[PDB]
């Protein structure tokens, strides 16, 4: 896709745009990644804001991360220490996925999904529609 076709560049410029902001149902309070790569460690110190904006757990995210990523981090007073170097966009890209498979309802889009546990099986889900997607993915 040539740089001179702004139009195609624009749709491709919205599809990377997060859910909460991208489409119709907009949880909209998700403030973006704040990353600080100190020495040889990455630290997203806006973490609590992300999790508390997504109304998901703090450690339920640290995990989804160290999974999609291969580093080790610990949580603390609303920040997070990652063991390697990670550009804000690498992390910005994973949080985007989390919201997609752990914070939104794929039947009726809704930031109102919530994590449920009905068998040793994690099925988490929508308080608005009632769909109970099996999410461990």
């Amino acid at each position: 896709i040539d740089y001179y076709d702004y139009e195609k560049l624009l749709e491709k410029a919205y599809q990377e745009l997060p859910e909460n902001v991208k489409h119709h149902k907009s949880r909209f309070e998700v403030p973006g990644a704040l990353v600080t790569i100190e020495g040889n460690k990455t630290i997203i110190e806006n973490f609590k804001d992300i999790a508390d904006a997504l109304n998901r757990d703090p450690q339920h995210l640290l995990k989804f991360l160290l999974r999609e990523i291969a580093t080790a981090g610990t949580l603390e007073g609303r920040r997070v220490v990652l063991q390697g170097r990670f550009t804000p966009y690498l992390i910005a890209n994973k949080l985007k996925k989390y919201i997609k498979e752990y914070v939104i309802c794929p039947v009726c889009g809704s930031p109102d999904t919530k994590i449920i546990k009905r068998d040793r099986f994690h099925f988490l889900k929508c308080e608005a529609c009632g769909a109970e997607t099996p999410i461990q993915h």
Partner: protein, 403 residues
């Protein structure tokens, strides 16, 4: 050669449209233990442009942001960033010899040409910098309707300017939407120029230091170290260099600088030590000089070269004045009254900064006595700044002529 930065990309646009955030996002991961320079408040941030072997996309990162595989080194570049509309303006007009292209960051959520956005395009226009890329940022804040209306605006703004053929890339410096396209465009537009390394070396010293610290070893603990931008030729470990204005002496006349010579012991470029450094990025030269002479950035503003082959040092200066039509400011500040005989102007040339006294007037040309000798090649552009209250405002620029 080295994998050091090959080109300098200036990050210009409104101070708030996102230039600062985009730079950090692209450079954060190539940081070791920015600035305000001392003369110009310019900062140099390197970034390795890489290509993901698996998905084929570009980024500024070691590991593909997306698929997760290892990316390959394609090139290393250095962005020039600076909080402060003026400082960037000054650095551009003065050291236009430093940039090789520029990325104009314009916010999509604001009418296109902001007073500050025009000034930059104005400066880029004056220094003939045509290798530009336009980054319409914050696309995450305007529906596709407003977006296309901004695009058109940008298009009408650049027509008949040096950025007339510059792409306009919709991006989210915050979410990184289309950073892969942007990074790739830096390779498409803004490629490493053909430079003849054999030309005699010229480096504009941005900073000078004393890396010494009561760490205390007395041996071959380092001498003075200078940091600057090679703009012509190349420096090589073991080279004998001649520094410019030079070190001050004791009142024969009143103040006199003699040009000093030293030997390069080391050279840092890209984070590592090399045996030969080239333009693009910042270069840290190691000398056999007395750290007592480079401490506190006293050497800042000087030029380095091969003994004999350097620019002429000046003590007086006539210029071909060209006042600027500035839009950012308040009406007072704005309609600049022309320079007057006896005014004390602020001058910026290369990385040198000095005060000058107007001692002559002509038709669009003036004379000035220099507070500090400045090593410069004639025909080089000099940034002229007038005070206006407590501050220093850029009112125009001059062209070095011979007296």
């Amino acid at each position: 050669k080295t994998r050091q930065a090959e080109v300098n990309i200036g990050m210009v646009g409104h101070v708030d449209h996102g230039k600062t955030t985009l730079t950090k996002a692209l450079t954060g991961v190539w940081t070791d233990t920015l600035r305000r320079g001392i003369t110009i408040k310019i900062g140099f941030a390197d970034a390795e442009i890489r290509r993901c072997s698996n998905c084929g996309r570009y980024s500024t990162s070691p590991i593909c942001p997306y698929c997760g595989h290892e990316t390959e080194f394609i090139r290393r570049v250095s962005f020039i960033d600076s909080p402060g509309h003026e400082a960037l303006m000054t650095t551009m007009l003065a050291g236009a010899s430093l940039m090789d292209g520029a990325i104009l960051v314009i916010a999509a959520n604001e009418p296109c040409p902001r007073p500050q956005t025009r000034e930059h395009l104005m400066a880029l226009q004056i220094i003939g910098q045509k290798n530009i890329i336009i980054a319409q940022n914050k696309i995450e804040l305007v529906d596709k309707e407003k977006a296309l209306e901004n695009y058109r605006q940008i298009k009408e703004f650049i027509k008949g300017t040096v950025a007339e053929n510059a792409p306009i890339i919709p991006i989210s410096a915050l979410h990184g939407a289309n950073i892969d396209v942007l990074v790739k465009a830096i390779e498409e537009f803004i490629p490493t120029p053909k430079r003849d390394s054999n030309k005699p070396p010229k480096m504009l010293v941005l900073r000078s230091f004393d890396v010494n610290k009561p760490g205390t070893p007395p041996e071959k603990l380092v001498g003075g170290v200078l940091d600057g931008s090679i703009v012509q030729g190349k420096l090589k470990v073991g080279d004998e260099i001649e520094i410019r204005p030079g070190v001050p002496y004791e009142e024969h006349g009143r103040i006199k600088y003699e040009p000093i010579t030293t030997e390069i012991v080391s050279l840092q470029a890209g984070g590592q030590f090399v045996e030969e450094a080239y333009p693009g990025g910042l270069v840290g030269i190691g000398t056999k000089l007395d750290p007592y002479l480079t401490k506190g950035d006293l050497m800042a503003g000087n030029v380095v070269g091969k003994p004999g082959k350097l620019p002429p040092v000046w003590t007086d200066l006539r210029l071909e004045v060209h006042l600027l039509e500035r839009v950012v400011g308040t009406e007072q500040e704005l309609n600049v009254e022309p320079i007057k005989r006896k005014e004390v102007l602020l001058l910026n040339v290369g990385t040198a900064r000095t005060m000058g006294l107007v001692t002559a007037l002509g038709k669009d040309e003036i004379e000035l006595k220099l507070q500090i000798p400045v090593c410069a090649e004639p025909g080089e552009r000099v940034a002229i700044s007038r005070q206006i209250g407590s501050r220093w405002r850029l009112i125009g620029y001059g062209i070095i002529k011979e007296l």
